[PDB]
């Protein structure tokens, strides 16, 4: 297919977790949660991330308890059998904005916004794709395209026409640590947060990988030595042939 149908490839930005000894910037995850809650939570879901997984990664225990209690989940029905509701706890999951898929497609002009809880693993490019898609919206589509109405141009989306309009604008969120919250800074923060939501094992996985790679490299070289020590007597074997006398 053509380059427009493929989509433009995202370049290789220098993320703070690129590299085998690195770690998510956890302040970037906290700021990215704020940008998700204030902008992305209107249309996209986070169906796989429990509230308890944020405790000790980006927020404190009470800081997560209050954000969970500001929502309302389905309780077990009362003693007369009527349905009940409940303030959220740490066991519950982060609720989406829509009750079903038809409400989503009705609210967003036929297209359904994907759940973002695995979206940097579900897309070729990963963090570079999410960042470059969010900041890739030009001010005008290139001269020649026929964009369908209700759709927007973004060259990193395959085909070009995406049903998400440009959502990130300068200083639409104020961070609580006083960071200048521009478009690029907010896209960096949400992409770090979505990468944490996809791979919440990332730090421990890289740390354990350091341990196994060190132990297994040492074992490999040490086993090369023990193989050469065992096979010394066969590698240094000498054969002499005196031809036997005819009989």
């Amino acid at each position: 297919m053509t380059a427009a149908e493929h989509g433009l490839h995202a370049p290789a930005y220098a993320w703070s977790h690129n590299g085998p000894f690195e770690t998510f910037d956890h302040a970037s995850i906290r700021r990215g949660y704020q940008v998700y809650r204030e902008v992305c939570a209107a249309c996209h879901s986070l169906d796989r991330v429990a509230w308890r997984t944020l405790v000790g990664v980006s927020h404190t225990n009470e800081e997560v308890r209050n954000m969970a209690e500001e929502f309302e989940y389905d309780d077990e029905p009362d003693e007369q059998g009527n349905p009940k509701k409940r303030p959220g706890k740490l066991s519950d999951y982060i609720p989406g904005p829509y009750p079903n898929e038809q409400a989503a497609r009705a609210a967003n002009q036929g297209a359904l916004p994907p759940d973002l809880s695995l979206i940097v693993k579900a897309r070729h490019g990963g963090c570079d794709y999410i960042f470059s898609l969010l900041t890739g919206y030009p001010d005008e589509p290139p001269a020649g395209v026929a964009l369908p109405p209700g759709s927007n141009y973004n060259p990193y989306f395959p085909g070009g026409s995406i049903a998400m309009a440009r959502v990130l604008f300068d200083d639409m969120v104020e961070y609580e640590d006083g960071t200048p919250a521009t478009t690029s800074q907010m896209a960096k923060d949400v992409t770090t947060f979505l990468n944490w939501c996809a791979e919440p094992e990332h730090d421990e996985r890289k740390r354990l990988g350091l341990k196994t790679v060190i132990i297994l490299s040492s074992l490999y070289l040490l086993s090369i030595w023990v193989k050469k020590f065992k096979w010394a007597g066969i590698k240094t074997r000498k054969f002499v042939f005196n031809p036997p006398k005819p009989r």
Partner: protein
């Protein structure tokens, strides 16, 4: 006599792994078999410990896999170990087969060993296809539909065998629960066939890279080849720990993190990377019935090899044209695998057709003609007349 000989079970263990007389000349390509044994044990153990948490319904399959990833302690280790260990199992199995048809191991004392190997290869392909179908992503679902709708090309009973495979009318809950029960089951058939592989090997013993007899000096397998296998075991675990811990979703496709949706096609349906050459073989034929007949023929053409090898010396160690055309075959297989991952665009259909023809002409045309030419060159280079 010794207790390791005067037992029932320790007699078998002694005869196979302790006092087994190996030819002393065998190089590092003779460790792929013990490597495949290690890989099989890895797959079985990690799969059992993930099946303790997997739920197989169509509405619970994908989310049970993410429950393994996010909620089970060290469950990402288990899932990444199972997936990358399956792909490593296939790379090592391709090396085992390429060694076998380089060094002439298929030949006349060991044809039943080669054929039990081909049966093992077919069973591992089936096992990995079912296990990729159990995770129920987007490539998983649509891979299941195109591979099962292959069988609708049989002109009499095709629709009923595909409706018997599906358990219904397309890939849904009976198909996924079936594929889980079978993806458990076929590995234990593979373990039985591996025991039969070892039994067919043990009667004549292994070959050697010279292709001459190895009956003259031999080495017991314990304390020499145990440690020579330990070297490759630690190397294989090192390279697998690299791919599991630092680069885990590299060999996989990203579209298996989209849940399976029967209404949206993912615009390039490709299987896992090791089934790409057979996928390109299937894709090259402009018919579906001939396509599946040619794919099954492409894997059943390993049986015509002990009858088309027309030469008196075993292996390609001392032949130049056999070496050259062997590596033409290997890079034809790699090009076929890369053609199978591309779209059906204009140079690729011709490239896949010509590479499929080269794949079939290797076994049926190239090996007999080159074998006969090398025979008469070996004769007239050294006899005088």
């Amino acid at each position: 006599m010794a207790f390791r000989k005067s037992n029932v079970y320790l007699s078998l263990v002694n005869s196979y792994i302790i006092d087994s007389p190996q030819p002393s000349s065998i190089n590092y390509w003779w460790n792929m078999g013990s490597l495949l044994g290690l890989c099989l044990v890895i797959q079985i153990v990690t799969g059992i410990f993930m099946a303790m948490h997997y739920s197989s319904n169509i509405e619970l399959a994908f989310s049970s896999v993410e429950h393994i990833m996010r909620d089970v302690h060290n469950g990402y280790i288990l899932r990444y170990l199972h997936a990358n260990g399956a792909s490593f199992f296939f790379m090592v199995m391709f090396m085992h087969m390429a060694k076998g048809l380089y060094y002439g191991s298929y030949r006349s004392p060991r044809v039943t060993l080669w054929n039990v190997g081909v049966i093992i290869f077919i069973l591992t392909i089936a096992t990995a296809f079912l296990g990729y179908c159990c995770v129920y992503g987007q490539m998983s679902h649509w891979g299941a539909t195109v591979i099962t709708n292959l069988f609708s090309a049989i002109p009499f009973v095709g629709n009923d065998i595909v409706s018997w495979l599906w358990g219904g009318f397309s890939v849904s809950n009976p198909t996924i629960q079936r594929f889980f029960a079978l993806h458990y089951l076929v590995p234990f058939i593979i373990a039985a066939m591996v025991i039969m592989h070892l039994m067919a090997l043990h009667i004549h013993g292994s070959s050697n890279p010279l292709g001459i007899t190895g009956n003259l000096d031999r080495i017991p397998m314990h304390s020499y080849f145990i440690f020579k296998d330990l070297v490759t075991v630690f190397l294989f675990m090192l390279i697998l720990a690299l791919f599991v811990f630092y680069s885990p979703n590299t060999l996989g496709h990203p579209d298996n993190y989209i849940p399976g949706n029967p209404l949206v096609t993912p615009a390039s349906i490709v299987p896992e990377w090791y089934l790409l050459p057979f996928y390109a073989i299937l894709r090259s034929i402009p018919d579906k019935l001939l396509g599946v007949i040619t794919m099954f023929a492409a894997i059943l053409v390993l049986l015509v090899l002990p009858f088309t090898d027309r030469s008196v010396v075993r292996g390609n160690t001392f032949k130049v044209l056999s070496k050259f055309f062997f590596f033409i075959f290997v890079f034809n297989f790699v090009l076929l695998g890369q053609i199978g991952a591309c779209h059906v665009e204009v140079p690729y259909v011709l490239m896949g057709q010509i590479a499929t023809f080269i794949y079939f002409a290797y076994f049926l045309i190239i090996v007999p003609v080159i074998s006969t030419i090398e025979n008469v060159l070996f004769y007239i280079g050294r006899v005088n007349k």
